[PDB]
Amino acid sequence: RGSHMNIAIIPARGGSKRIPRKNIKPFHSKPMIAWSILAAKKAGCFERIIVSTDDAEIAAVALEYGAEVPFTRPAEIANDYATTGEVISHAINWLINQQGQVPENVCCLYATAPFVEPDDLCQGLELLTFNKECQFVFSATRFSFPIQRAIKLDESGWVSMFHPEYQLTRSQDLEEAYHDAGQFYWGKANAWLNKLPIFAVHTQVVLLPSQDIDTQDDWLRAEKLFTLR
Amino acid sequence: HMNIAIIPARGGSKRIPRKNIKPFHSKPMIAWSILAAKKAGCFERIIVSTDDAEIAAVALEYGAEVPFTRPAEIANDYATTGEVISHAINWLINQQGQVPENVCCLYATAPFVEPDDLCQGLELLTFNKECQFVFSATRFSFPIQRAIKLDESGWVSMFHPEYQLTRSQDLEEAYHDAGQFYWGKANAWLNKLPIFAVHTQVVLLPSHRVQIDTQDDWLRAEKLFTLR
Ligand SMILES: CC(=O)N[C@H]([C@@H]1O[C@](OP(=O)(O)OC[C@H]2O[C@@H](n3ccc(N)nc3=O)[C@H](O)[C@@H]2O)(C(=O)O)C[C@H](O)[C@@H]1NC(C)=O)[C@H](C)O
Ligand SMILES: CC(=O)N[C@H]([C@@H]1O[C@](OP(=O)(O)OC[C@H]2O[C@@H](n3ccc(N)nc3=O)[C@H](O)[C@@H]2O)(C(=O)O)C[C@H](O)[C@@H]1NC(C)=O)[C@H](C)O
Fold it and tell me: Does A83 sit within 8 Å of B213, measured CB to CB?
């Protein structure tokens, strides 16, 4: 289109167990979710920035940092089984149905992403739009150990390999593996709405360099890295 | 009985040249392993197995022994860690009449290694006769079953596409070797017993203490190492 409509949706549900109130817990000098909102603003490639949440405290924080909160996320998709795509589809359909706004491209930006680089958000959009075959672009990172040589542990702590054939295989002889970094996901609006699979041959990645923020301890480590220069 | 450390530190590399002695926070990588082994106090001897004279000199400078030059054929890009340890144990038996009981393979690129973990690994090994090895491991933070690969044009595919929409908590947990240490009964090493097998236990490390792909990883780790 001649007029761009690229939007950011930040999913954030309440109810975290391991880190209570995780999305509004202070990280450095701001509630954690604010770092994602601010990265989307700084990027400068979003027409709108929306938080999708069922939680009143999270919504209030979102408005404070200049995200929109146009709706309350339906209760049925704020649960332990709803997927990222379901949350993003809801938001896109809401914009279409309630405001007559049809976005072009839609970026899902997770709420725990203080190390996200704003330029990477716009890099992702440029990659998405550069290759017309492409339906999604997401942040990914390499595994630092060959997944083919992974182990499991039984309840008595005894080791076995997932693939014992690779006991003595060299790391450099195995196919390189990557994983979703859980930061951002660009998609064509229709890719989201048609529930197209993200990890598939119509998707590219932006590769990030070598953070877990899953535990209270992890939070403390990240605080230190955040201010390193 | 006689518990020793063997640090296998060849001159060649799969990727980063001279990684075993590259400076990490202002000392050669191998120095942090030697210092940890000495601090741990549970080794009768600390031996570096190397083909490379530069590495030998670093090993001697930090107070490890270099009793032999490792033969070249077990310092190439294909020889396994176990073959290096077997060579060293057989050398000790045949050349010095020394018969170790437990042998710790301690890698040279493990600057976060903790002395207390080295001694704990020995205590675990020697509490059960069925246990042949104990090594340092850590959990994968992301489910390996949802891993992807990239083609030469950057397009994504899953290793296991059936797990596209599967929750992390519905997949079995996976771990990996942390590349720090491996305690083994001497005969386990000599008999070429597999390390990743049901006669082996681990010492689980929080992944924050298991480290380097890039020059930038290298710089970052150095700085975190200082804030650890
Ligand atoms: C126990 C086990 O499975 N370990 C895995 C290792 O993987 C490899 O790791 P690497 O990074 O190439 O080598 C690890 C360290 O050992 C030294 N080194 C190594 C070999 C040698 N002949 N002489 C040395 O001196 C080398 O210089 C380096 O410091 C890899 O494939 O890259 C290869 C290792 O030989 C080992 N593999 C097996 C089946 O032993 C892995 C960590 O799980
Ligand atoms: C695109 C993709 O595959 N992503 C993977 C995700 O995995 C999971 O990650 P998570 O950490 O549980 O949730 C990610 C973020 O979304 C929030 N959240 C989540 C759900 C919701 N209904 N409402 C929210 O608001 C949650 O609080 C957190 O901030 C996991 O299984 O752990 C679950 C995700 O639903 C998603 N899985 C799929 C197939 O979409 C993975 C990263 O590769």
Answer: no
What is the C-alpha separation between A142 and A171, in angstroms, rounded? 13
In a domain, B43, yes or no: yes
Question: Given CB atoms, is B127 within the 8 Å cutoff of chain A?
Answer: no
A146: distance to nearest CA of chain B, Å?
Answer: 8
Cβ neighbourhood burial of A228 (10 Å; 0-12, 13-18, 19+): exposed
Please state, in angstroms and rounded to a whole number, the distance separating the CA atoms of residues A145 and A149: 8
Distance from A20 to chain B by nearest Cα, in Å? 19
Whether residue B215 lies within 8 A of chain A, CB to CB, comes out as no
**Min CA distance, B201 vs chain A (Å)?**
5
For the CA of B52, the nearest ligand = 1
d(CA A218, CA A208): 19
Q: Is A177 helix (H, G, I), strand (E, B) or coil?
A: coil
Q: Are B200 and A159 a contacting pair at CB < 8 A?
A: yes
Q: How many domains does chain A have?
A: 1
The CATH number of whichever domain residue B107 belongs to comes to 3.90.550.10
**Could you give the 3-state DSSP secondary structure of residue A220?**
helix
Q: Domain span at residue A208? A: 6-139+180-227
Are the C-beta atoms of B125 and B133 separated by less than 8 Å?
yes
Residue B150 lies in a domain: no
Q: Is the Cβ pair B200, A158 closer than 8 Å?
A: yes
Number of helices and strands (H, E) in chain B? 6, 10
What was the experiment behind these coordinates? X-ray
The CA–CA distances, whole Å, from A145 to A172, A175, B177, B212 equal 11, 11, 8, 10
Strand partners, A184: A109
The resolution of the experimental structure, rounded to one decimal in Å, is 1.5
Strands B102-106 and B3-8: parallel
Q: Where are the beta strands (DSSP E) in B97-195?
A: 102-106, 133-139, 148-150, 156-158, 175-185
Q: Are B57 and B130 in contact (CB under 8 A)?
A: no
What lies within 8 Å, CB to CB, of A132 at 6+ separation is: none
Q: Which two tokens stand for residue A81?
A: 């089984």
Q: Is residue A172 part of a domain?
A: no
User: In this structure, which long-range contacts are made by residues A117-120, counting pairs with CB atoms below 8 Å and at least 24 apart in sequence?
Assistant: A117/A39, A118/A39, A118/A40, A118/A42, A118/A43, A118/A44, A119/A43, A120/A183, A120/A184, A120/A206, A120/A208
| A214 reaches B (C-beta below 8 A) | yes
Q: Tell which one of A22, A33, A84 to mutate to probe ligand 2, the residue whose CB is within 8 A of the most ligand atoms.
A: A84
Phi/psi of residue B132, nearest 5 degrees: -100, -30
Q: Is residue B118 part of a domain?
A: yes
